[PDB]
Symmetry: C5
Subunit: 311 residues, 5 copies
């Protein structure tokens, strides 16, 4: 067929709704997630109108090839959604109600600055291109926007799913394009990061500081170098569950900062020993005693500064 | 076509059955599993009735496009199942018997609290949306629910596969939706975790405690720090075969707890040495002797407490 | 169409054959393998019979939608095979000869008890469901069962591919089902496991035993703990190329057993040192001398016992 | 149908445009990236011309099977693009305007010489094969070449997307082929490599040099060998995020160079000790003092030389 | 339709050609590679002949469903190729020229004996099954065999792509099958293996030998055991980029051999110490001095022997 023609000179309003059935596979590195959802569309096609009293039925079904249907697409998807059309109902006045269930893999960038205490706003951008015959524009039927109460996005809490109601209308390749921004707001379940990464990483650091209550260089080197190695493991573990950002992450900072602490601890340990060998154990012992306070205090100050800067 | 019309204002009952042919790929991290199964549907379409004596045959075949078939979907799947229709039989009174074989990848959340001694209840949710003309409702033909005796779910024992017989009927976007809960109950084969992870992890810990029968700081540091490193490896190995939970897992607890034991062992070892150097080997030696009992005893108490809390 | 009706009261025999063109991707963890093969089917459809003199050709081609073809399926596949039909020939008497080339990923469980000296029997189960009108039964044309001379399963030797000729006929959901068992018998190329895993693992163990010719506790601890760590690496490497079994594997046993040897070596080393410090180097030295023989002898006995128990 | 015939004897010009909607998945190892884009085509088909005054409309839609459309393909793709046709408009003079949205995975080699400070030029090669009846040739409508302002290629900055306007026309299998080069110019966000890899790698190296202020062989060996091990980890980490090049990468050089520094540090440490044992601590001490300056100075010179050679 | 019938009693010659557009993804472990290529076919169908002077055109196009086309298949592919048909031209005498572009994933075994200095011969086997009506045979049009000059197979140099011109004709399931062997000859770019694996592995080994200029058992144990651990890492790294072969690889040998050197170095170090403790430092010192020459000399001899045996 081809598009409904205008009563006057008005653009065709296509009403939209997304209802999320499943969110899954939030891939931090790819910056993607998968969705399974109802997509609902509604518009006026005069051509399809009818009399309820004459026709005997108050609604009419159609198969999708029978009528004109707007080419709605997702902007930020990897490949075109799989969609199974569920239902098409036309009411007497020629109002069409379309309903598909779809699944798609969606590109949407993530801000890792506060990882792993971060929150994100995922987007699904619906779009339509205007044809020559007629301009098409999108709108949001809020009654058809939602998510079910089970949706679980393993590793994240889901706050809200709402749509920015006013589309962005713009020219692309000499046609009008109308674009809606659906927004899925989430925040990361940070709990497990504490016992699995953060505390272990501290424990190894604090073990490194036992060298400040020790006069054995051979022990000290072993303490500080072994723990430094373990820290690297955690650095590596962490930098692998995350992509290459052009900014420091919060955890990144702490991790990096900690290298400085290991480095300086090695210097102290080196200096202590060097002085003992020159028979200045008195001076050595002042530095060691200072280190016992300076290290943990500066560590604490530094973290407060960092948390201040990142939150 | 379109749905069979009601004698009077009664909903259409669609009878369901799932018969599992294969379960496989229980992915702990994605919280998914794959299934290969018969799906059976049955319903009354009066329009399709016939006389056996007149028509000459007592059952009639059809191809799926020929008749009306309800749009049954799975709720908790990644993408719509692949289904090949096997057989459609209509009996004289217009009773339709549908049978497909399908495969699907199913989202179903797992409770890791008692891992790896955990059991799970997987769900497959069948659903149908009511049309305008007619309300549809699902029911369970218990004679068509089962699994074959071979279904092996590598890494798990299968207890039962049963369906909750009373559907959950609810409004979604101003239509009735009817949802059945099929339940596959499993429990994890925990055996291999003992030799591969648990005992090794203990053995390294117990080796760390040999420092309590030693006066060599250089040895002790090496004992405790090396074993601590090995423990980290196991922590890492374990946290990678599992997803990020917002709750402690049982194994998680033990693993985390064990870091405290390493930490305190380092303190003891540090203290012992420090006293020897101040010529108080007598006090050192009391602490070392106490540690020999305190460590294993507190370890045992702590584990009893944990197992109590988790089981 | 629908199935050929019987001359008398006999079930329809569908003759089968599988000819393997490629085996590949034996995935130990998933317990799957991939196959690329001819599937050959043959049956009598009288309805399709014809005169060579009238029709002008001596055999007739068809496209699969044109005629009735039995719904033959694989039982133990992940998803339905990709099949490209190669040829359908119907001979004058209505004898159909079907030939597809297919590929599928096949579930078939593996017994890891003697890994990596294990052999396996893979299965491909062909099946057909009987319709209402007619009972269908499968049989094996032995002349159409085989494999290519160059079919290779990287990491395995292929012994035989044969079919159990007598189907298993049984009721499922009130219809007859007929099931054939094709069997691919293989055995693992164990060679590479010797230089890459087994010997290294021994070498590190034997290095640990050099502590029996040493009086340096600091050295000994380092010897035994470092090698123990290397052993863990191999344990981890091995447990990752394999799934979680509810039984001990042979290699698993050895690996696990070896932890006990490391543990006891640490005890010996600890004891030796403790006695030296109490000025009983004489007793220490007896234990050390005994250990030099006891360890390797008990190791040998233990392995003989294990190999006996597993083979 | 088949191609438009020429007014005279001129080749058929097909005008092209690519508008990038999404770039993603730049896989360094595979040397690929994924794209989602509009492809626009335009050409003259006289046969389709019409009178605006007679026909009543000034533009005509068609479905793709209705008219002749050139077989445009991508050269450097893994498999043929998924394309959904968006719009086909024909203007009175028989000028066709084609528009598809496509997605494809594109092979395009990367030069790793300056990694991770590298820039790249990705290519998308459009191509068309001439038929017997007519020569077909491609051209670039610059007004239909662009990318939207959001395109984000996680880990990279995007400079430009432009097309080389003059096609390369050449014989392949005795027909003319016409090929356009679209060019996406990018440069790597190198920031994260500094804190995650580069600085750590230096810090461990500088720690190794503390052995130059130490007289303990047992400590020194531990310092230098442990840090060497950590360096290997980083070598391994790095060589895994990259493919096997037949040329040195910049980072590769530094990494490799650093092994020489560890090697020589071990020699120094070995020599120092050997002399102390022969009661020549005076000579030892000159070498150690020299090493304190020589190592960092030569390290600096060497890096300047390398950066000069690579930039 | 069905096949062209013979003028006399001759088999139908189908002329073939493969022109490689892209080679990629040479996966060493799977022993596969991916290809993107033109497949060209040519044969005589008398039925399609025509008069150029009468018909007015010297060539005729067809769509593939219109005419008979031989079922050419690849033998050694995972799944049937994706193919888009490009062009079908028929010349007056009924000579058909077919051209598709395809992509496929190809199984072809690799000989790892000389890795990573190995060369390989990849195969693509084209095949055709004869029908009842007619025998089909394949041949190679050498003018349609080639690859473009860009084909880059990341990690490999490409020597040649040629076809063995004489097919192998043989019986399979009582029909003739005709099989062509296309051969892609490649050799591995070994350069990067030197700096990334081989030299590091030597450097660690040579560091182990510094224990021959040292009298400290505690140092020596640390030197030799730490380096042994690093060697294991490289063994593991290497055995993971490769499959399980039933033969020694060259690199495998060296790696394995090197374990023996570490083992014996531990024995030497153990012996040296044991003698020092029994106050025989004189004998110890002879063995240590011998080791300084024996180790590197035997290492060199052994490698010469191995390279001789493998090349
Ligand atoms: C007592 C003076 C100590 C001064 C502190 C040194 C900090 C080094 C700054 C690095 C900046 C990047 C190039 C790094 C070499 C390692 C430093 C070893 C210190 C030796 C101590 C000798 C005791 C007298
Ligand atoms: C190493 C040092 C430890 C790391 C410190 C935690 C960082 C933090 O404080 O994280 C902050 C988060 C969430 O913050 P928000 O909701 O985004 O705040 C918005 C603030 N505005 C509106 C002002 C911008 O709260 C937490 O879950 C705290 C739990 C911390 C447990 C730490 C374990 C030890
Ligand atoms: C008698 C000593 C009691 C030791 C208690 C140690 C505090 C533990 C903090 C828990 C943090 C979670 C910040 C930690 C510093 C390292 C510990 C140094 C121990 C020195 C012993 C000296 C012997 C006289
Ligand atoms: C540190 C050491 C960790 C020990 C782990 C104990 C786990 C446990 O005790 O868990 C018990 C689970 C069975 O649990 P269930 O059948 O679900 O009972 C639930 C019913 N309630 C609610 C009434 C209790 O299985 C086992 O017996 C595993 C065998 C233990 C082997 C340990 C070897 C060392
Ligand atoms: C001479 C006494 C032999 C002692 C054997 C102890 C074995 C423990 C068995 C655990 C089973 C798995 C819980 C174990 C603590 C570490 C043991 C330290 C040995 C100290 C020797 C002192 C010599 C006088
Ligand atoms: C760690 C200790 C070393 C492990 C020793 C291998 C176990 C084994 O000896 O296993 C035996 C298998 C063969 O068994 P089968 O073919 O199943 O015969 C079953 C017949 N019965 C049931 C009558 C016994 O290996 C081999 O062909 C020999 C390989 C030896 C390599 C070892 C090098 C070191
Ligand atoms: C005082 C003499 C210094 C000589 C340095 C020798 C470096 C060897 C270069 C290999 C190049 C790749 C094959 C390498 C042998 C191990 C090195 C042993 C060093 C012993 C020092 C003893 C001090 C008297
Ligand atoms: C280990 C030693 C440290 C590594 C040094 C960085 C290499 C570099 O200096 O690289 C330079 C590239 C930019 O190159 P370009 O300007 O794009 O090329 C054109 C150059 N011509 C005109 C000369 C041909 O990146 C940078 O801005 C590097 C800034 C980060 C510093 C890293 C801190 C440590
Ligand atoms: C001078 C004595 C020569 C030693 C030769 C070593 C034979 C090892 C054979 C292993 C075969 C695989 C079973 C391995 C035990 C470790 C060997 C420890 C050597 C101790 C030296 C004592 C000095 C007098
Ligand atoms: C650790 C020990 C060093 C590794 C030895 C290198 C391999 C080799 O020596 O092998 C040689 C192969 C080439 O083989 P070919 O010429 O095709 O043989 C066919 C000849 N016939 C007919 C005699 C059989 O590699 C090379 O191009 C050499 C580059 C080596 C650099 C290594 C640096 C260290
Ligand atoms: Cl879409
Ligand atoms: Cl579904
Ligand atoms: Cl409700
Ligand atoms: Cl309703
Ligand atoms: Cl199947
Ligand atoms: Cl394409
Ligand atoms: Cl194929
Ligand atoms: Na339509
Ligand atoms: Na239907
Ligand atoms: Na040490
Ligand atoms: Na059929
Ligand atoms: Na067309
Ligand atoms: Na055809």
């Amino acid at each position: 067929v081809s598009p409904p023609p205008p009563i006057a000179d008005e653009p065709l309003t296509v009403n939209t709704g997304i209802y999320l059935i499943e969110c899954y596979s939030l891939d931090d590195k790819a910056e993607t997630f998968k969705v399974n959802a109802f997509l609902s569309l509604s518009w006026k096609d005069r051509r399809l109108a009818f009399d309820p009293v004459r026709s005997g039925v108050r609604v009419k079904t159609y198969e999708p090839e029978a009528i004109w249907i707007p080419e709605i697409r997702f902007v930020n998807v990897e490949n075109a959604r799989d969609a199974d059309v569920v239902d098409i109902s036309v009411s007497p006045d020629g109002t069409v109600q379309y309903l598909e269930r779809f699944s798609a893999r969606v590109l949407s960038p993530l801000d890792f600055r506060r990882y792993p205490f971060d929150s994100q706003t995922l987007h699904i951008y619906l779009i339509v291109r205007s044809v020559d015959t007629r301009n098409i524009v999108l709108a949001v039927d809020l009654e058809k926007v939602g998510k079910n109460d089970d949706v679980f996005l393993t590793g994240w809490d889901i706050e809200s799913f709402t749509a920015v109601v006013k589309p962005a209308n713009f020219a692309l390749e000499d046609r009008l394009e109308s674009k809606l921004d659906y927004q899925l707001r989430i925040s990361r379940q940070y709990f497990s990061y504490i016992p699995n990464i953060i505390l272990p990483m501290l424990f190894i650091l604090f073990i490194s500081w036992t060298a400040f209550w020790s006069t054995s260089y051979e022990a000290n080197v072993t303490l500080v170098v072994s723990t430094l190695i373990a820290h690297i493991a955690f650095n590596i573990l962490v930098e692998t569950n995350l992509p290459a950002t052009p900014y420091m992450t919060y955890t990144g900072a702490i991790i990096f900062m900690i290298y400085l602490f290991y480095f300086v601890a090695v210097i102290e340990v080196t200096v202590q020993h060097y002085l003992k060998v020159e028979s200045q154990p008195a001076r050595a012992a002042s530095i060691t005693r200072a280190s016992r306070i300076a290290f943990p205090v500066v560590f604490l100050l530094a973290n407060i500064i960092l948390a201040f800067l990142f939150f």
